[PDB]
Amino acid sequence: FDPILLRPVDDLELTVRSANCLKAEAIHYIGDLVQRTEVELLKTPNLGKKSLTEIKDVLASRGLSLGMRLENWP
Amino acid sequence: DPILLRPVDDLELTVRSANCLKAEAIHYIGDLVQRTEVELLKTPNLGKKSLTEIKDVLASRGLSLGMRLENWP
Amino acid sequence: DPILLRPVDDLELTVRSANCLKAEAIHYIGDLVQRTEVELLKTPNLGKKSLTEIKDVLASRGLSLGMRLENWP
Amino acid sequence: FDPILLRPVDDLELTVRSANCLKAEAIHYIGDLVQRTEVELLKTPNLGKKSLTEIKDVLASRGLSLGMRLENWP
Amino acid sequence: TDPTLEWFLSHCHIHKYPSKSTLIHQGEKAETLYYIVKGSVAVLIKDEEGKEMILSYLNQGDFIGELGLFEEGQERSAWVRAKTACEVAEISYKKFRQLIQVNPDILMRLSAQMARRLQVTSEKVGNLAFLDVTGRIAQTLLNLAKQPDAMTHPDGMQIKITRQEIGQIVGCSRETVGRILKMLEDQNLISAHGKTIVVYGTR
Amino acid sequence: TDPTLEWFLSHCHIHKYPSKSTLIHQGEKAETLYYIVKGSVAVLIKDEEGKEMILSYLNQGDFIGELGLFEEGQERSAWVRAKTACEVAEISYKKFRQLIQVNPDILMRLSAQMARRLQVTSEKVGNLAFLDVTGRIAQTLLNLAKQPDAMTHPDGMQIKITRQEIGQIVGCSRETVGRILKMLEDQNLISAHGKTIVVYGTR
DNA sequence: CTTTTTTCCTAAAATGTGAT
DNA sequence: CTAGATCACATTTTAGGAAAAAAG
DNA sequence: CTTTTTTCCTAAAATGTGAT
DNA sequence: CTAGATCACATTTTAGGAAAAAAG
Ligand SMILES: Nc1ncnc2c1ncn2[C@@H]1O[C@@H]2COP(=O)(O)O[C@H]2[C@H]1O
Ligand SMILES: Nc1ncnc2c1ncn2[C@@H]1O[C@@H]2COP(=O)(O)O[C@H]2[C@H]1O
């Protein structure tokens, strides 16, 4: 498993724009996020190139990325 | 069908999509499923992302576009 | 031809080649040019390098092997 | 031109075996030698792999080699 | 944080190359070494008729024009063209050699990348000698899903590339790449609509 | 006299490899670096069916098995087989790295050779993508007349090689290499009798 | 005398063949 | 459209080493 | 107000076609 | 024998930038 994947998405300190999209897509934990795919996220309303890029960049600075493949979830 | 008579709002669309339908006179989900994809794209302020959101919210609820209905209204 | 009657020695061969001809009864250059290549290779103590030296010393003097002569001797 | 290519073949200090083959093939000057081709030399009587190799090795230690292409000769 | 690269860059001239511009022309004299700070380029070679063939893509982090640095008076061995827009660190061979003699680590990093390219290019040779076009294309779709700019996608990795280009990678006609992309779709191996291709089963 | 190479060798284990023996097996772990003191080897790769393809010949002076030296736990990328009989200097990666930190010059010499191989191999790619079999063969006859063991010959450079082998170099069948060697003979470009081939117009 | 060249030998490898 | 691959086997060609001949 | 997303547009590039 | 290349042009698809709509 991993310890960071269970913290809320807020521990990433995103912008208001990004934060509001995740919370309206039911993404509460960082573990839910890393499982979501890039193409999948772009379809979510109010999330465009700059927000998508901010997310891939805040995850990268913390070892993680998108489209990660997890087991035993939740 | 029962769902085809509920207002379009029961789909919980984005503000952008909601405003386009209401300016195109689409009030009931039954009116929507009858509209064709090519037809919708011409409607002002509705582009690839909104059109895609609509086809995706209908798909999650069994329905789709260009459906062929009888006895309407 | 005039050259075909001179002894084989006028070719200035190596000791190895000279000794093979003289043990095969080839005294005159005329006897040599008549001999065939495949025939010569069978003669003891005569291998690729000697056979090649002979074909090369004859070539530098117009002649070759397997030549077909009349009135011999 | 070159200065070394005009010295006699003897300045190479070859073996008796090699020396005797060159002098019976009319190779007096180092310039005559470097022009001769490898395949051509091997046909010369009394010159085999070891002598041919000694020659290519004594020339190499002196910048030169076989099959060199010269102009204005002699 | 990376001490060596930071030090290296601080001795370079940084220069922006617009998308589609040429950084290196095959045949030109080689006196400068490049390092891609941002962007991506395509390393290509050409036959007499002018036909193109993509040797490789290089990305942020990769050195370019390193091959002329070991022998004097060598010529650029290939065209290098900016795929996207690039920002490139530049340093003269002469002055780069001076860095090496101060800290050989930078040379290590360069040689690391060379070794990799040799392995990758050698494989490309095997691909050309051993695989039919379908094999080379299939292989290339897998290698393209490896690149950085490839997007993660539910069914597998999603990529953006033209049929024409794939053709220049695997060395065949564009018409053919089209036919095969259509077959790999019946075989439910990929999803192709436009420049957009989803390579099923990666990720 | 060469100070650096002499110093390098003095830290190596020298080992004789008989003709036709394998120095390196593709797939094996990479922990040792080789240097050819005497002899010549063939670098080759294989497809699943077992078909061979000669990536390159290396000769006296060339390093081998250098590619595993930059990343940890890499695998030999190709078979390396003794063409003639070889004498090979050997040194563990671990201990070679230690030399580098004493005198980076040795690393320069290694990287020089890598750069060259990349240029040569890249060209092989172009040859495969651009030339028909006649073109690749013609090219290969010219490249084989460049090798050390090629003998000078009055009409042009003389070489010893089999049709089968040429096939494994240019990536085609041996029957085909035979037909083409027979055509290049009508066109008075070469002289072919046995393994012996004179490539007209080199030298 | 010794050393190098050259012969001379056969298992095994390499080759051509040519219509589809 | 064409360049190449393909098939098995009788025949050709090679590698390389003992031994003989000749030169040093 | 400002910033980001999303629409909406056309020259130009990319594509399929299928018998030999 | 078969895999691929080949031909020109009507049609499809893209890049990317101004401008409008919506969110912050
Ligand atoms: N096979 C290859 N793979 C990756 N990069 C290459 C390859 N061949 C050439 N290049 C790059 O293209 C550059 C062209 O200029 P250089 O010869 O100076 O250096 C070359 C390499 O940086
Ligand atoms: N394209 C190539 N050209 C020359 N040599 C190569 C090539 N590919 C691999 N090699 C050599 O074969 C070796 C196989 O083992 P390594 O990967 O350790 O290192 C490799 C190189 O030394």
Side-chain angles (χ1 to χ4, degrees), chain A, chain B, chain C, chain D, chain E residues 2-203, chain F residues 2-203:
Chain A
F1 325 73
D2 217 77
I4 195 177
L5 309 184
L6 46 78
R7 284 167 163 256
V9 282
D10 311 335
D11 293 355
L12 286 163
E13 287 190 8
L14 294 169
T15 69
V16 185
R17 178 153 216 119
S18 308
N20 293 350
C21 298
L22 302 183
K23 280 151 190 168
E25 280 278 316
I27 304 194
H28 314 298
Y29 301 79
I30 294 188
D32 297 323
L33 191 70
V34 292
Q35 280 194 161
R36 293 302 186 100
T37 152
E38 190 171 346
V39 178
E40 195 184 10
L41 267 181
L42 266 179
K43 296 187 180 176
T44 75
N46 285 326
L47 209 175
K49 258 220 305 181
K50 184 149 186 177
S51 294
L52 201 285
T53 284
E54 176 210 1
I55 289 174
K56 287 193 311 184
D57 274 334
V58 76
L59 294 185
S61 75
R62 309 184 62 154
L64 321 184
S65 75
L66 288 175
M68 300 196 76
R69 226 166 267 264
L70 256 41
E71 309 157 336
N72 296 159
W73 205 267
Chain B
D1 217 76
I3 195 177
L4 309 184
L5 46 78
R6 284 167 163 256
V8 282
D9 311 336
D10 293 356
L11 286 163
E12 287 190 8
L13 294 169
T14 69
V15 185
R16 179 154 216 119
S17 308
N19 293 351
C20 298
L21 301 183
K22 280 151 190 168
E24 280 279 316
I26 305 194
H27 314 298
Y28 302 79
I29 294 188
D31 297 323
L32 191 70
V33 292
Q34 281 194 161
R35 293 302 186 100
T36 152
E37 190 171 347
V38 178
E39 195 183 10
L40 267 181
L41 266 180
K42 296 187 180 175
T43 76
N45 285 326
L46 209 175
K48 258 220 305 180
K49 184 149 186 178
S50 294
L51 201 285
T52 284
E53 176 209 1
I54 288 173
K55 287 193 311 184
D56 274 334
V57 76
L58 294 185
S60 75
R61 309 183 62 154
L63 321 183
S64 75
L65 288 175
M67 299 196 76
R68 225 165 268 263
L69 257 41
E70 309 157 336
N71 297 159
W72 205 267
Chain C
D1 217 76
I3 195 177
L4 309 184
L5 46 78
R6 284 167 163 256
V8 282
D9 311 336
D10 293 356
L11 286 163
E12 287 190 8
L13 294 169
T14 69
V15 185
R16 179 154 216 119
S17 308
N19 293 351
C20 298
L21 301 183
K22 280 151 190 168
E24 280 279 316
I26 305 194
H27 314 298
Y28 302 79
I29 294 188
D31 297 323
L32 191 70
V33 292
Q34 281 194 161
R35 293 302 186 100
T36 152
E37 190 171 347
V38 178
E39 195 183 10
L40 267 181
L41 266 180
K42 296 187 180 175
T43 76
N45 285 326
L46 209 175
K48 258 220 305 180
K49 184 149 186 178
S50 294
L51 201 285
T52 284
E53 176 209 1
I54 288 173
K55 287 193 311 184
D56 274 334
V57 76
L58 294 185
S60 75
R61 309 183 62 154
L63 321 183
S64 75
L65 288 175
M67 299 196 76
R68 225 165 268 263
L69 257 41
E70 309 157 336
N71 297 159
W72 205 267
Chain D
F1 325 73
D2 217 77
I4 195 177
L5 309 184
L6 46 78
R7 284 167 163 256
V9 282
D10 311 335
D11 293 355
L12 286 163
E13 287 190 8
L14 294 169
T15 69
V16 185
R17 178 153 216 119
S18 308
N20 293 350
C21 298
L22 302 183
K23 280 151 190 168
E25 280 278 316
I27 304 194
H28 314 298
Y29 301 79
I30 294 188
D32 297 323
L33 191 70
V34 292
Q35 280 194 161
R36 293 302 186 100
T37 152
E38 190 171 346
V39 178
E40 195 184 10
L41 267 181
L42 266 179
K43 296 187 180 176
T44 75
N46 285 326
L47 209 175
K49 258 220 305 181
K50 184 149 186 177
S51 294
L52 201 285
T53 284
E54 176 210 1
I55 289 174
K56 287 193 311 184
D57 274 334
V58 76
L59 294 185
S61 75
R62 309 184 62 154
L64 321 184
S65 75
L66 288 175
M68 300 196 76
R69 226 166 267 264
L70 256 41
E71 309 157 336
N72 296 159
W73 205 267
Chain E
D2 189 334
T4 290
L5 281 189
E6 280 301 310
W7 162 75
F8 165 73
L9 295 178
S10 85
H11 281 72
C12 292
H13 175 61
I14 309 305
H15 184 95
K16 271 204 183 77
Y17 288 87
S19 163
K20 306 197 170 193
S21 53
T22 288
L23 286 60
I24 305 209
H25 307 255
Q26 158 153 13
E28 281 179 326
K29 283 304 168 186
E31 293 169 343
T32 299
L33 169 76
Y34 302 91
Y35 177 95
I36 296 173
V37 178
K38 206 204 174 193
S40 63
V41 297
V43 180
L44 29 79
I45 67 178
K46 302 178 172 178
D47 61 359
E48 56 281 344
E49 317 148 13
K51 196 157 68 182
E52 266 176 24
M53 219 266 187
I54 295 187
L55 258 202
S56 158
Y57 290 156
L58 306 174
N59 304 287
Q60 159 188 151
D62 291 332
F63 288 97
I64 338 165
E66 76 282 349
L67 294 187
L69 159 85
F70 298 98
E71 197 172 32
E72 285 292 19
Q74 284 200 105
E75 307 197 347
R76 298 305 198 196
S77 64
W79 283 264
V80 177
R81 178 195 302 153
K83 180 178 144 177
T84 71
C86 297
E87 180 160 294
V88 165
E90 313 188 350
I91 179 164
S92 76
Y93 284 172
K94 170 170 179 52
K95 298 176 194 183
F96 176 73
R97 297 200 190 87
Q98 293 170 11
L99 288 201
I100 290 181
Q101 293 211 26
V102 176
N103 182 0
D105 195 59
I106 193 56
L107 177 55
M108 276 294 283
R109 301 218 185 178
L110 177 64
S111 291
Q113 298 201 357
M114 273 188 286
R116 150 89 37 238
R117 298 180 190 179
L118 189 44
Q119 300 167 166
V120 180
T121 296
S122 281
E123 186 171 344
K124 206 151 200 283
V125 167
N127 288 336
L128 287 180
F130 295 141
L131 307 172
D132 60 352
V133 180
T134 307
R136 309 206 299 283
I137 277 169
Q139 189 59 235
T140 295
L141 288 168
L142 301 180
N143 297 144
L144 281 182
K146 297 278 169 294
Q147 302 274 326
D149 46 346
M151 281 176 292
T152 144
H153 170 301
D155 298 33
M157 225 66 83
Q158 193 191 70
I159 58 170
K160 298 270 263 69
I161 196 179
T162 77
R163 265 138 279 245
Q164 214 153 41
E165 195 149 6
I166 286 173
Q168 310 191 292
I169 293 180
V170 308
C172 74
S173 76
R174 64 164 180 91
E175 290 96 326
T176 282
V177 168
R179 307 190 165 104
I180 292 183
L181 279 191
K182 180 42 203 161
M183 294 194 332
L184 302 190
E185 219 158 344
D186 305 343
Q187 311 178 204
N188 258 288
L189 300 188
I190 67 176
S191 177
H193 305 100
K195 267 165 77 155
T196 308
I197 296 178
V198 207
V199 191
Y200 291 147
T202 325
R203 205 188 99 197
Chain F
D2 189 334
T4 290
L5 281 189
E6 280 301 310
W7 162 75
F8 165 73
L9 295 178
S10 85
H11 281 72
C12 292
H13 175 61
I14 309 305
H15 184 95
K16 271 204 183 77
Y17 288 87
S19 163
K20 306 197 170 193
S21 53
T22 288
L23 286 60
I24 305 209
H25 307 255
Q26 158 153 13
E28 281 179 326
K29 283 304 168 186
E31 293 169 343
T32 299
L33 169 76
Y34 302 91
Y35 177 95
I36 296 173
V37 178
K38 206 204 174 193
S40 63
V41 297
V43 180
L44 29 79
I45 67 178
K46 302 178 172 178
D47 61 359
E48 56 281 344
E49 317 148 13
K51 196 157 68 182
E52 266 176 24
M53 219 266 187
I54 295 187
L55 258 202
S56 158
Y57 290 156
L58 306 174
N59 304 287
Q60 159 188 151
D62 291 332
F63 288 97
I64 338 165
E66 76 282 349
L67 294 187
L69 159 85
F70 298 98
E71 197 172 32
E72 285 292 19
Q74 284 200 105
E75 307 197 347
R76 298 305 198 196
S77 64
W79 283 264
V80 177
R81 178 195 302 153
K83 180 178 144 177
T84 71
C86 297
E87 180 160 294
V88 165
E90 313 188 350
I91 179 164
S92 76
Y93 284 172
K94 170 170 179 52
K95 298 176 194 183
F96 176 73
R97 297 200 190 87
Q98 293 170 11
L99 288 201
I100 290 181
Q101 293 211 26
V102 176
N103 182 0
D105 195 59
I106 193 56
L107 177 55
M108 276 294 283
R109 301 218 185 178
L110 177 64
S111 291
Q113 298 201 357
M114 273 188 286
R116 150 89 37 238
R117 298 180 190 179
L118 189 44
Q119 300 167 166
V120 180
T121 296
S122 281
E123 186 171 344
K124 206 151 200 283
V125 167
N127 288 336
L128 287 180
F130 295 141
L131 307 172
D132 60 352
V133 180
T134 307
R136 309 206 299 283
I137 277 169
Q139 189 59 235
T140 295
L141 288 168
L142 301 180
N143 297 144
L144 281 182
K146 297 278 169 294
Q147 302 274 326
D149 46 346
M151 281 176 292
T152 144
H153 170 301
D155 298 33
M157 225 66 83
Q158 193 191 70
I159 58 170
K160 298 270 263 69
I161 196 179
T162 77
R163 265 138 279 245
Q164 214 153 41
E165 195 149 6
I166 286 173
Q168 310 191 292
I169 293 180
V170 308
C172 74
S173 76
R174 64 164 180 91
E175 290 96 326
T176 282
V177 168
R179 307 190 165 104
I180 292 183
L181 279 191
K182 180 42 203 161
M183 294 194 332
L184 302 190
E185 219 158 344
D186 305 343
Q187 311 178 204
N188 258 288
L189 300 188
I190 67 176
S191 177
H193 305 100
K195 267 165 77 155
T196 308
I197 296 178
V198 207
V199 191
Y200 291 147
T202 325
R203 205 188 99 197

